Amino acid sequence: GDVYAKTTLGRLFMVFFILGGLAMFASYVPEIIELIGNRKKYGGSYSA
């Protein structure tokens, strides 16, 4: 609430953008997080 939209067009865009943006964030951020972090854990080689 420190910064928000005061104009009528800005508030209208916020109203019609929440429905899409909230869903996109919720369905995208966890997937991006899990895609990066699923790397190999015990890969490598033994040093004689």
Add this chain to the structure above:
Amino acid sequence: GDVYAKTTLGRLFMVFFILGGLAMFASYVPEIIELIGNRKKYGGSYSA
């Protein structure tokens, strides 16, 4: 927080609406989004 209910009756309705409205939004918006995004991605006719 720019705009909110200031009357006691409006606050009471907000209290009793947050119980049901939030669940309705969270269970309806993703389903509505999914019900529109499913189409024939490769449907079409070959043009010789």
